[PDB]
Symmetry: D2
């Protein structure tokens, strides 16, 4: 299906009372006119409709769109990206199982793996974002391989097909976090991944307000994630926030295109600047990763990082505090132009003392280039 | 603890821009003017403020009010009752542990325990809602006792102090689901429970719209639930819904008192009706459970159940389809007058074919009496 | 109909998709499956549904309830109490017309009358809240009599039936602002008033968040107010706020009863306190107005005023700033316990330098009594 | 004026609690710590903050952004476009005054003028959207000229500078409805208009949900509109909706550029189609109006109209009912692709039986081309 059909019409043929904006079904429950119908609702896995820890008319419309965008059979919205990640992981794991996890996965994904390994008999091997290392860490007990591409902070790309070929051969399940690219620029289901997750907090909502996660994949997986993890743990998204996602989704293609255009300008400037050591933005044609990246992605988002020429946390501090346009904050995926130096985090690797992450928003990239330029001028050569 | 102070003023002395309604902080993030402040935010457990999977100004006000109502040191709002239950359970259990769970706990609580039991090395003993049976099922590996009082569907009360006395002697943690009473009518922290959970979906929001859970307890437990389970699994409540809980809270005492008044009228009617076998409403003074109940609770809510004199599902269907005021729906805790016969559920015990749960709302209880009365007229007398 | 049927079930038999909470129809527009239907929508006065400056499914449910509560045939929700007042006034007036307006009407109602009289050929006589003075001010050109009872600030009651008898005889239209009592405690349509208005900002919403107004009356009046004033001026209420009113309405009877109970306690204390000259709360049995008030009202709300023994704005300031529970703010009608001394206003009459208005909320009235007591002790005898 | 600075940063330097999304101040009121401050609030025109029929922190941020986009000194958000129009009109008119109103103004604007004319001593001259006809209708009692460019339904452009040159010489005030272009593509303040109004219902919100109006202009006018009309008539916008306008504003430039690109494709197709008589889209370079239009506008929106070669309402019905992508609905300004034939309206001029208005949204314009194309195939060729 076309992106535009998905964003602007799919699922919207028949709306209650012929409203054109889908109504917000901010209800816990739904009444029944008959006992028989109520009994069906309380026996079947997914009756439409019975209860908010369950399907919701507003939320389902958005889920239907998101699934179609990821070319998955089904999707579910949940309260956060971490709900999507943690529930997906729980679905695929039991006592005695092993997981291979890329060691540049989002920090809280790794924290969750560590939490399960401390509390239960789950073994985790952390490996670099390198398909060969990933397949080398597979054991006879491996049930899950957890991917992210591009990775967190360092924006490294993995050869996904190489991993999923091996996984598929061995009946090992794969989960990928595709938040960085959005569905506009990468569709990992088509690269053979079983389940795709997003922090919809970032690009899918796009406005730095809603917190939400998406789990997408095949009917069998998603039916079981729904009736087991979702119903038992209950990370329900507010239908008001689902409606806000729908609203945000309308501009997703326009926004992603803008971020890509802007990120090319900013990454080009950073790559050529004498005070920047290196730039991590895999969809710039001059990137060392471009050939692999562009084999898997149709564009890149606004998120990138780069390294200063220093190992001094103090020089990094000088730099970031000198920025007048980029704002110091976490999160990303909106109009906001954001900066975070990795050295701010307690668990920052020593190697990444010099690593700065920026998010390029929806405005005039020359303003961002000038901000970076003036700040770079203020640190010593 | 003063209820009105908590509902109407606690935490509200200083509000951004001197607004009287607390603003809705519907933001993912918060900016920093200083690298040093940002570093503190990204190293410390709970910086105010940095990120939505984190503390939020709107949500934290409501949390502080809820903790104070429960006379607990701290509380967190989460996306549903099941989030409050599941995260609390996970906080207290690891591989090799045992749990005692009352077998009339809310269905999804039991489903979660069974999920854990199937997936990990967690063993669960299910016991009747009887303090003695609960304590008897303790083993040397028991790390959690999971309570609910009154219980789901049957509204059975448990001697909570008898359980917590035993648990505390053995360093076993307790969790209780206090949704039924609300914090107005029961405060199990004062009965020795470690962690109190609610489905704020029900009475605390009170308007059949928001879905939310509450976890409340001591500083140590709550700090760890926050930094471990909440940040890892992320069942974050929308600040918009937090604000709607705040709005609903303002009438919580008024609503709870009205439900209790109404429930007395309805339960009295059912108790005296020839075609009703029995009524499960433990805060009616004629209830067999009243002495124990009234030692732990200062009132009762609108939720009750009763049995018809029958073993026929079809007769229960006849009765429920005859009602014109009560509406067939799940959930409860609002103005809505709701009915669900337990036999509608696939996993209904055989014994509970005749069990009907009703929720008495905020209106004229005589309308509910008349509705029940006209429905009871249309079913046949039981065979003798 | 019973209050409880109105609050809890009227209009809620059939809700889209069987939700029990009425969905929020936050839509500008509605699609049509046929040209014929669209043509009807664009020809008829009130098609269900076509456009948000028009009927809305969410808003209409709340309007239906409000009308039934006021025992009026129809009602409309608008953006503020002043929208309800100003549109009602415009409906009844044209060039060359005269109005009698009670001179203790809400200040902005009087400002609006003054605005019309400056800009257009509208003459206004302001009179005390006294039915005899009101009927004495009627001229052959009088088209409207504007009432409020109890009045603003001074909480005076008018004999409404005496006014409406005379008005009805002369084909003069009446509008009353019934915000003070709420529909729970007074239903002026039953006392013969043509159109009833409320600031739903106050008790009807009840939570100090929504701003909204209600216009209620007969079909003929309301049909014309809708198609003329409402459509031309457009003070549309957000359906999100309508839904919040519906939510608030659920507790309206519980809240009004509580406010009345509390106000009796506080008014009794004020009446007996040696530093209070007089108390304006007409539904206290010891009030000089009680016989008339209780002939028209079934109870009283939380709003009252009282006078200190002083003509010093400074002593009033001392008093109000000494209160630690009552908060200095305008508005009223919620849980909030609020105080405003009339002398704070620029246009405060000299006579009212000593007049304090308080709103008694939903809590323990002894806390309010103790606050007043301690503050009263701190001013000189 | 820098568009991106306005959309993305202006006014957002300091936000309560350092939130990055501005909080929703859904409050009626604000408390005071001091009697003196409360007295200032209740005497002054515009205290920050005191009451919702008043300034609001959320709404004021959006207002300041909108004023800056229009290059006006101040702006106020109100409950609908018609509130912005009606209050602006009332501000400039009193008993005995005359107004010149373009006769292709939005229908409800004309209805309001007629309402005023019927009720009070206000006289109105309706004129074609032609600067010369407008200026010719000026009288010694004219106090207001009411403009809209492009006009409703027919998308006619007016030489605004010719009108404002005349008005300014005679101390006559001008109001213009700039909804069609949005502030991205036309800024009539720079063309000499006194007060600019929008239905933010349409492009400024841009998502077919919020209803809102904007009034923008100089300090003097806006201060008086605020303290007189706005506080007296009270068409207050919900802060929740203000926040949704803020959210919609972030993509305003992206959306407007896309509508323009799409509208060029669709208008080019219609212009070259044998069964279309004419196309009203003044920012297509082949439009007869393009030279005047492009002197005042930097782009065009998605709204256009065109005529079929027919005088038959039934043929227009045939065509519109044949469309499968465009949806029959009023309003415009979002992603929605909408159609309304003017003959659907009861008051449609006879000349406009063949006039069809379409709104081109944010998708693939070729889908719209194909839909129009397949519909045009199914109507008969015009008689010759």
């Amino acid at each position: 299906m076309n992106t535009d059909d998905i964003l602007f019409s799919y699922g919207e043929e028949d709306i209650p009372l012929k409203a054109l904006s889908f109504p917000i079904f901010e209800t816990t429950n739904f009444y029944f006119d008959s006992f028989d119908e109520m009994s069906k609702a309380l026996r079947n896995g997914d009756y439409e409709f019975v209860y908010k820890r369950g399907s919701n008319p507003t939320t389902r419309l958005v889920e239907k769109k998101l699934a179609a965008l990821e070319e998955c059979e089904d999707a579910r919205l949940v309260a956060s990206g971490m709900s999507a990640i943690s529930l997906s992981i729980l679905h695929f794991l039991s006592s005695g199982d092993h997981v291979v996890c890329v060691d540049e996965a989002y920090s809280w994904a790794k924290k969750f793996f560590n939490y399960l390994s401390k509390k239960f008999d789950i073994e985790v091997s952390y490996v670099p974002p390198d398909a060969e290392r990933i397949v080398e860490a597979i054991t006879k007990k491996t049930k899950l391989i957890y991917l992210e591409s591009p990775t967190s902070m360092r924006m490294k790309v993995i050869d996904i097909r190489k991993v999923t070929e091996a996984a598929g051969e061995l009946k090992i399940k794969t989960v990928i976090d595709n938040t960085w690219a959005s569905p506009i620029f990468q569709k990992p289901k088509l690269l053979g991944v079983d389940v795709v997750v997003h922090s919809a907090t970032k690009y899918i909502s796009g406005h730095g307000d809603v917190m939400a996660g998406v789990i997408a994949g095949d009917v069998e997986d998603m039916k079981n994630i729904f009736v087991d993890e979702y119903k038992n743990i209950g990370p329900v998204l507010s239908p008001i926030e689902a409606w806000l996602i729908l609203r945000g989704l309308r501009t997703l293609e326009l926004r992603m295109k803008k971020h890509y255009e802007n990120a090319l300008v900013v990454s080009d400037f950073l790559m050529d600047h004498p005070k920047v050591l290196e730039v991590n933005y895999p969809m710039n044609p001059r990137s060392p990763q471009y050939e692999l990246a562009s084999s898997q992605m149709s564009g890149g988002s606004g998120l990138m990082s780069f390294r200063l020429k220093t190992d001094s946390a103090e020089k990094v501090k000088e730099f970031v505090e000198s920025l007048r346009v980029f704002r110091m904050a976490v999160s990303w995926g909106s109009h906001e132009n954001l900066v975070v130096p990795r050295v701010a985090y307690g668990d920052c690797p020593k190697k990444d003392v010099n690593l700065i992450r920026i998010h390029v928003g929806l405005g005039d990239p020359e303003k961002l280039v000038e901000d970076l330029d003036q700040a770079l001028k203020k640190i010593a050569a």
